[PDB]
Amino acid sequence: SGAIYVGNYRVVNRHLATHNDWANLVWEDSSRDLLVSSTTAQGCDTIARCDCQTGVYYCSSRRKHYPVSFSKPSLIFVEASEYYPARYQSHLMLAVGHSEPGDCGGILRCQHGVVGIVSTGGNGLVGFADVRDLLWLDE
Numbered sequence: 001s002g003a004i005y006v007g008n009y010r011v012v013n014r015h016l017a018t019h020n021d022w023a024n025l026v027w028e029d030s031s032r033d034l035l036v037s038s039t040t041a042q043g044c045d046t047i048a049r050c051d052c053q054t055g056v057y058y059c060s061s062r063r064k065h066y067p068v069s070f071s072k073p074s075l076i077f078v079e080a081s082e083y084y085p086a087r088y089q090s091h092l093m094l095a096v097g098h099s100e101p102g103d104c105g106g107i108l109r110c111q112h113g114v115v116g117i118v119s120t121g122g123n124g125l126v127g128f129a130d131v132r133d134l135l136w137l138d139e
C-alpha cells in the first residue's frame with residue numbers, strides 16, 4: 001500500500017484504489033496502473049520533473065529504503081491477477097531490487113522529489129509507475 005499526496009490530489013495504484021478514490025475520481029489509466037482522486041487537505045509532496053535513472057524506494061516487505069538504478073519509462077508485459085489480464089503496462093520503469101505484491105504504493109524518489117510508485121515486481125525486479133510526466137499534478 002501507499003500514496004502520493006500533492007496539492008488537492010492523491011495518487012494511488014489503480015488496482016488498490018478505494019470506494020472514496022473512485023467516488024472522487026480525477027483521472028485513471030488502466031494501462032499505467034494509476035488513479036488520482038481529489039482530497040480536502042493540501043499535499044506537500046514535490047513531484048520530480050527530470051530524467052533521473054537513480055533514486056531510492058521504500059520496500060514495505062523489508063521495512064527499509066533501497067538505492068536503485070532504473071530504466072526509462074516504457075511498455076512492459078505483466079501477467080494476470082485479480083486486477084488485470086496479461087498485458088503491456090505503459091510508463092513503467094524497472095530496477096533490480098526486492099519487492100513482493102504488498103510493496104505496491106512504495107514511493108521511489110530522486111534528489112528532485114517523487115518519481116513514481118511501486119506497481120510491479122517479480123524475478124528480483126521491481127517496477128515503478130512513473131508520475132513525472134503528469135504536469136497537471138502541480139497546477
Ligand SMILES: COc1ccc(C(F)(F)F)cc1CC(=O)N1CCC[C@H](C(N)=O)C1
Nearest residue numbers: 033078081099100101103104119120121122
Ligand atoms: C510489487 O508487486 C509484485 C512483486 C513481486 C511479485 C512476485 F511475483 F514476485 F511474487 C508480484 C508482484 C505483484 C505484481 O507485479 N502485480 C500484481 C498486482 C498488479 C500489478 C500490475 N501493475 O499489473 C502486477
Ligand SMILES: [Zn+2]
Nearest residue numbers: 050052110112
Ligand atoms: Zn530527478
